[PDB]
Amino acid sequence: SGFRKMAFPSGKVEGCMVQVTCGTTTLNGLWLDDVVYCPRHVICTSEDMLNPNYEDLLIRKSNHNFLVQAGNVQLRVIGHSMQNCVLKLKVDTANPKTPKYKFVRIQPGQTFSVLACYNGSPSGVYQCAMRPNFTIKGSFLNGSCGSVGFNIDYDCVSFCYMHHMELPTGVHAGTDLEGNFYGPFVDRQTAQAAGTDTTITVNVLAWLYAAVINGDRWFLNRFTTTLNDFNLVAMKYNYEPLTQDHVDILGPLSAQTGIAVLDMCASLKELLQNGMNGRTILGSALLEDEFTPFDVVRQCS
Amino acid sequence: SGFRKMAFPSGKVEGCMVQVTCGTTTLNGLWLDDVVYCPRHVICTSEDMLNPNYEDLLIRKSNHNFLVQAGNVQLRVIGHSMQNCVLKLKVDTANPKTPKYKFVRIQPGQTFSVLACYNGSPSGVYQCAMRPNFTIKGSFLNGSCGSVGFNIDYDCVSFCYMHHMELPTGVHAGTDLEGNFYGPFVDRQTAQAAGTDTTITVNVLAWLYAAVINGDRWFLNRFTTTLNDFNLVAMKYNYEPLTQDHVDILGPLSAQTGIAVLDMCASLKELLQNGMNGRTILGSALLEDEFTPFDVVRQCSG
Ligand SMILES: *[C@]1(C(=O)O)C[C@@H](c2ccccc2F)n2ncc(C(=O)Nc3ccccc3F)c2N1
Numbered sequence A: 001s002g003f004r005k006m007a008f009p010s011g012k013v014e015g016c017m018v019q020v021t022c023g024t025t026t027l028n029g030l031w032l033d034d035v036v037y038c039p040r041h042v043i044c045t046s047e048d049m050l051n052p053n054y055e056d057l058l059i060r061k062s063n064h065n066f067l068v069q070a071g072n073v074q075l076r077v078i079g080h081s082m083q084n085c086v087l088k089l090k091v092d093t094a095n096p097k098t099p100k101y102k103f104v105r106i107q108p109g110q111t112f113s114v115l116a117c118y119n120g121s122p123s124g125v126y127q128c129a130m131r132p133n134f135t136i137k138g139s140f141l142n143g144s145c146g147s148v149g150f151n152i153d154y155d156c157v158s159f160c161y162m163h164h165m166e167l168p169t170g171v172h173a174g175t176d177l178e179g180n181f182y183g184p185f186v187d188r189q190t191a192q193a194a195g196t197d198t199t200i201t202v203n204v205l206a207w208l209y210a211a212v213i214n215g216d217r218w219f220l221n222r223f224t225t226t227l228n229d230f231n232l233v234a235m236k237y238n239y240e241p242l243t244q245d246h247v248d249i250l251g252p253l254s255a256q257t258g259i260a261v262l263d264m265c266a267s268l269k270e271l272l273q274n275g276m277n278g279r280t281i282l283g284s285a286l287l288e289d290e291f292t293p294f295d296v297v298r299q300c301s
Numbered sequence B: 001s002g003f004r005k006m007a008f009p010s011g012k013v014e015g016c017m018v019q020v021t022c023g024t025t026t027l028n029g030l031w032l033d034d035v036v037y038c039p040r041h042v043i044c045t046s047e048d049m050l051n052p053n054y055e056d057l058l059i060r061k062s063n064h065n066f067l068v069q070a071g072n073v074q075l076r077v078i079g080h081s082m083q084n085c086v087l088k089l090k091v092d093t094a095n096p097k098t099p100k101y102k103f104v105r106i107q108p109g110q111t112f113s114v115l116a117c118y119n120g121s122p123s124g125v126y127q128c129a130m131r132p133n134f135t136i137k138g139s140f141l142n143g144s145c146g147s148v149g150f151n152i153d154y155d156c157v158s159f160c161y162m163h164h165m166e167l168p169t170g171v172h173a174g175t176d177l178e179g180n181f182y183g184p185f186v187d188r189q190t191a192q193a194a195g196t197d198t199t200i201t202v203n204v205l206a207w208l209y210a211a212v213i214n215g216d217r218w219f220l221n222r223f224t225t226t227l228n229d230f231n232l233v234a235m236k237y238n239y240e241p242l243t244q245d246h247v248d249i250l251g252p253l254s255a256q257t258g259i260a261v262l263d264m265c266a267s268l269k270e271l272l273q274n275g276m277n278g279r280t281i282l283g284s285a286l287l288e289d290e291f292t293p294f295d296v297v298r299q300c301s302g
């Protein structure tokens, strides 16, 4: 029993973290096979980040203008390229600790573990959700760029995120491992608007099932609802619309608890309209939306 | 910016997790040098846990009755001994992945990372606080016993906790790495009272400092208090009394934010007496106490 925000064991990813330096700038890199991936803004100086011309800046750089360090040992760059917003520094030696890996571009509402790093060294690990507005609510300080997000499937590491910036509003933005930003963000020191964020409805319902499995049932009510009627309330409270796909994804949790998905929706409608009235669910005074149905199943089983 | 419950990277601990089987019972073990550490209840059957005589049960066990497996590598058990509530199985080979380590008995209020494991395989990592009543609020299922809690200092792993049981109340109990339980708990399937739990006051104040560093300052007030005055409110609200030692440990955060500790105490007093009025602090509608002043410094600067 007990329900916790749980990150994946980070060992397979720790062995891939390197320090990347280009002039005065030092950030983190991911060494997989003979390639080191890192944010391309590593090639920018203070007077460049307002509107950098990355193609021009990268031309002024040579393979030897990048110092890559894995622990104490220095790696040698034999070819540099730019793929969207990521720099790919090809090194002469393959990382012997390269795990079985995949690059995946996750969907909003999905979760992953962040291995926060500083100077190529892992500092901590925590679980994040990709918000519906494509930002993440992380914990990042200067030097944390190049830190990655990932999921594990048995022995396969699926890398899905690379940290690129903290927006002026304190929220975090980054790319997939092909350098494509999640959301409308760009790699420049400019005020950028994140969309209106919404609550991940299917994740709140999954967490309500996690609470039922762990003994917290006070919120289960005599009322019920329809999918279209529930969405009327959800739209008022800035919750993302619930589809039949979301109901289907919730099927295994519904079966384990004996609680119909629409009945759990009925309980959630009353929690939104009437609030929690100073009560807690799984140790929280707010409705939690950063656990997917898969996160609940794998933690409870 | 941002504030999160952050665990230590678990790689150095993953290389130490093994599977330990004794008859039908399988749980996790910790392999450091040529010793495998695990809960002594591994030698019990379902109908032994009511009141086991561990010394008598262990006498019926020989080295070959313990099957120890690190991945697919089978370890050969050449010695066995019981130290308090842990079994120490001597194996014929040193773990090549043994990191630099220490065994520590943490104090109540201190935090640590838990690497939850099943069948000797790691499944997740999360941070826990050793509650003032010596329980932890974790996430453990059947098969999780033998999972460890730890802290990392540079390259050194300080193992502080081994999981042994979930009480009927749903909370978790275990030992340090010398097999001494935290709290009054025993390793038997019996109803056991965890005392009244109290809130770690120094940790709540540290998190209020973390909130101010992150821009959350609505709760800051034009009031001040004294140590004894604050403590009359802390005793009313089941918060542990604040001492000058806690004040001193908060020193760095007070210096960084420019907010005196007794002034932060006055804000906490107003929050205890008036609630949060439906507002949030660092993404929470509750006062948080599972972050120490060290956890705040490591994250807010580091
Ligand atoms: C990242 C790096 O490590 O190089 C760090 C990251 C950052 C900075 C400060 C606090 C947290 C945090 F995650 N970061 N944000 C922005 C940038 C950057 O290179 N440029 C920049 C500056 C200001 C606003 C937007 C922007 F893109 C970095 N660098």
Ligand SMILES: *[C@]1(C(=O)O)C[C@@H](c2ccccc2F)n2ncc(C(=O)Nc3ccccc3F)c2N1
Pocket: A001, B026, B027, B041, B049, B140, B141, B142, B143, B144, B145, B146, B164, B165, B166, B167, B168, B187, B188, B189, B190
């Ligand atoms: C642990 C093991 O893996 O052997 C598992 C742990 C447990 C059980 C169920 C849910 C969560 C959880 F952490 N556990 N709790 C108790 C015990 C045990 O061996 N005996 C027992 C049973 C009930 C209460 C106390 C008690 F000691 C285990 N074993």
